[PDB]
Symmetry: D3
Subunit: 227 residues, 6 copies
């Protein structure tokens, strides 16, 4: 049947009902295919070295996620990436977790949304062969409201298409779209966030005034993709 473990790399600024729902979606999919059984889901907040704009320090991110998942029987956080001194290429993170498992072989597979995927085209953001290796040796599960675009994008690229049998596009009927950005912005304006993220999360947020604008100013100088 092939046990699987879904890895989700991402900034995970304010983790939100969405990211949680993604896991719900991906699972129901693969389980529902018959050729799979989802064993566990891993959230892996990016390190601070990633240096993206408005990226608050990892502790908060890892914490929030954990709080976020406290009540889940299959999704657990995982801090290895957030502690590295140097930013980690997704490929390396995937390998890591796979190698770990090899110490009855659940395949690790990259969980993701459209953006990630489409970001494959950003110049210098990815190592051509990184993409290859990823798609080739570890699956890629993409859950989106924008099914078609995702599928064109694949059609559009020889590398992806060649390994399309390892890429699954999961349709998000019922619109999520609770983007980190919109959530931060709300916070910044004293809006509400309630119901868009898990309570403990909200509460962790409000008692700690985590998102400000002083915060959004963070890292106003080139991310760690430029090699």
């Amino acid at each position: 049947k092939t046990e699987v473990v879904l890895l989700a790399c991402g900034s995970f600024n304010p983790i939100t009902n969405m990211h949680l729902r993604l896991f719900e979606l991906a699972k129901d999919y693969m389980n529902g295919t018959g050729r799979y059984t989802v064993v566990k889901g891993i959230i892996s907040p990016v390190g601070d070295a990633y240096k993206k704009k408005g990226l608050i320090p990892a502790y908060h991110r890892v914490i929030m996620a954990e709080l976020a998942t406290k009540n889940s029987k299959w999704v657990e956080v995982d801090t290895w990436e957030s502690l590295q001194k140097e930013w980690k290429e997704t490929l390396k993170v995937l390998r890591h977790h796979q190698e770990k498992l090899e110490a009855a072989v659940p395949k690790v597979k990259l969980l993701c949304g459209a953006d990630l995927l489409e970001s494959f085209a950003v110049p210098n953001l990815w190592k051509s062969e990184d993409i290859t290796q990823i798609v080739a040796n570890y699956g890629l599960i993409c859950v989106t409201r924008a099914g078609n675009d995702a599928q064109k994008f694949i059609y559009e690229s020889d590398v992806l298409w060649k390994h399309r049998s390892n890429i699954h596009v999961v349709n998000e009927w019922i619109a999520n779209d609770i983007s980190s950005t919109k959530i931060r912005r709300a916070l910044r304006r004293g809006q509400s966030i309630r119901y868009l993220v898990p309570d403990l999360v909200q509460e962790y947020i409000e008692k700690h005034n985590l998102y400000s604008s002083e915060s959004e100013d963070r890292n106003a100088g080139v991310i760690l993709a430029p090699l």
Copy 2:
């Protein structure tokens, strides 16, 4: 400043993060206008006499809502409508709650989405003067992803436009759209619902297999609008 109390009539089949979020939205709005202060929010599940398709029996609806709101300091359920033997015209429900308050006068105002509003045009669904009275003597707060349409619709009708100063369209940035229907359908197929509704709710649902299809067959014969 004018204290206000938001009344939300609706089937409230599976109440969901959305309906809860609506209240969050409406409040933040009126409070943010300065000319208002939201005092309390009321959920009022429809009676069974409404006889709409797939409408499971009220007990469940009222319960679920309550569970739904257990943790809210300002939104409370209210069962008066669900007990009436005859289906109640929204106008009558509004009056009720207003009259109740008159026993320092918080104005009751109808909380709602686009559908409701647009349903004003369905033939025989509303008593022309009911609309009038509603809009005239009690406000109408409409939160939507479809701001424009809502505003055209108003522009489109002399009755509404005339009382437009009592109608407020609230823009839903960050897409909700967790419709009851999609949730039921999911349930029916053993999907997940998790994160789209409050846990106690989910749990109440799963321990009780509330939505089936046998259930959706309910009331396959003309609703209570036809007078």
Copy 3:
């Protein structure tokens, strides 16, 4: 690996390069999945009993198809259905060919575009259990330019969704859309048709002035879906 035989029932008024391309698309898909091997394709024109508007006599339809396929190694016509006295439900046609094969068991699968699919919703056009049996015991392969729509349509139905794992939506990159309707029209107005249909067809058409308008008037009275 599972050998497969693609069955395409359809009026096949002027068969056109589209029809032919669908088979080419369908096959490349299945074969390209690894779980399949496309063995042969069958074109089965409707009988005259179907009584659809502008449906010229089977003889012309059957022949044109044959000419159309004369040069194909794997797609052949089949006249069983065009001969029956009474219109035949697609489920019966599927059964027929499957049973004939059972006289090493290639699964017959229904080749299809969106229209047919989406017509499962027209009232009285299909016997609910027919759809079910179809999708359950024989696959459904649907090639379209409208991927998402088709997928929504599936999402939108308990029956289909349930048997989703036997329904494949094949995306048609590169627009076809040479509808029979459009070609009839053209013919009617002395346009061209060349390069939209196979030459032998074009030729058979022009030497026989097959489509007129007197012809389009054919069957101006209720098709044979109405039981």
Copy 4:
């Protein structure tokens, strides 16, 4: 009545049913206006000097067209452009053929699609006066699925608008879109192509493995528009 000859310059990498259909469309239009009589159509593959990416050697391009036109009574190929040692501006080619005819004067008219037309705005791609001369002394026939855009395009340009009476936008009902790019891609992937291009063409292609990807890498360095 004014006899006309339609000239189509273009890379004509895999010539396809589309290209052929264009002629059939343009003709029908002009002839159907009553002001014109289409005498002959000319295919003129671009030279190798053009230095476009993935542009395979001319001889293949010319041969394939010739096979594609073998059975046409009025569309013939023309190799004068493919033999030039320096890339030829479309204006020169137009003159060429016109001059040729002047040795009862059929007007040569440029046949094209939207992209060509829209390329008039690309910086440095065209000599302003070249555009002028073309549109002024030789017509421009543009068949498109994107009628409106084409017409805005004209509206938005003083030069074109001024000579609008010599520009005809021919609407393509029934979708073509068999782009050479799409074809090449398919070929690379072992797809089908059958029924997108004329048979002799496909055969010529299969028996010669003409498109590979090593081929697509051809000319990875600035085309000969930059003067």
Copy 5:
């Protein structure tokens, strides 16, 4: 060159800058084709017998047009239609004016917008042969913001397409859309109208409270298309 007269039949409830602009557009087009010379334009308000909803008495309609055209060198009103005691089919009015001219023969051509044209499909609204005659013996000039639609519309109709050479679609860049309906509504609501209609018109309207709503209730019972 063929001199032409543009005739516009229409309710012309509040005539507006739009109506006037139409003429200016149509003219510019025909004159700009070189095949034509626009001699005069005629406004012909419909009679009261037409029995359209909200159709105020003709005299007001005719007067307002006249004021609206007072300062035009070529567009004049024409009251023959407004005096008839029975509603007149557009075809009869076209004949009328043509006949008139025949007492050097300027062709009368119907000036209109999309809706009119598109109304050709409304059941029972038009006598099939009426359409025929109109389009065949008198041209049809259609200015629209919705160019494409208009052109599909023609493509989709055998009758129209056959006479397409007598139908001209004139594209309206720069949005009009000052619909009489919109105007009336405004008026009812005490809005503005200024700069949507000619000043003498607005003044005529203000000094006469012409549009009320009691007025809009006019003719609440089937127009005179139903023969």
Copy 6:
């Protein structure tokens, strides 16, 4: 009630009925809110120092506006800005008129379309604090056909959102869109312009051949936003 004076800064190249209608729309809104009373409207053409492309000399702009407003009871031109030696920041112009009023305090408010608004995002075009002061101490009234966009734009910005209660978006039902650009263009090609601009304007334009193309070439070098 709060008296108000609507200030509209703009190039006012050919002033057009649109410009005039904006004032009509703006006023009906404010007055129709009850919280306001529109006292006067001011048109303030830009100085020549602005140095925008195709900006003909202030004299013509100022005069045309005056002619345009000659017949208005409440909208008057104002030449203060056109006279200054140096281009003037809109904030200064707002201040000026406000200060002049303070010599019973009518609030001056900036009248505006979407473009201006949306240009708050162009880099270096506006001084962040200028926007702030503007929105904070002087309102911003924006009439558009693109309501939502405008509202999103607001949503999308901390600064604007913060002072949202002083920004009103007025919806323009009935399409205007007579852009100066379009009219210039037309003029350039001898089209018409009649009914899009006030007659006295049209007249002043045609007797003076104001717009040419030599004129459009004016200022082909960097506007005065670049500080």
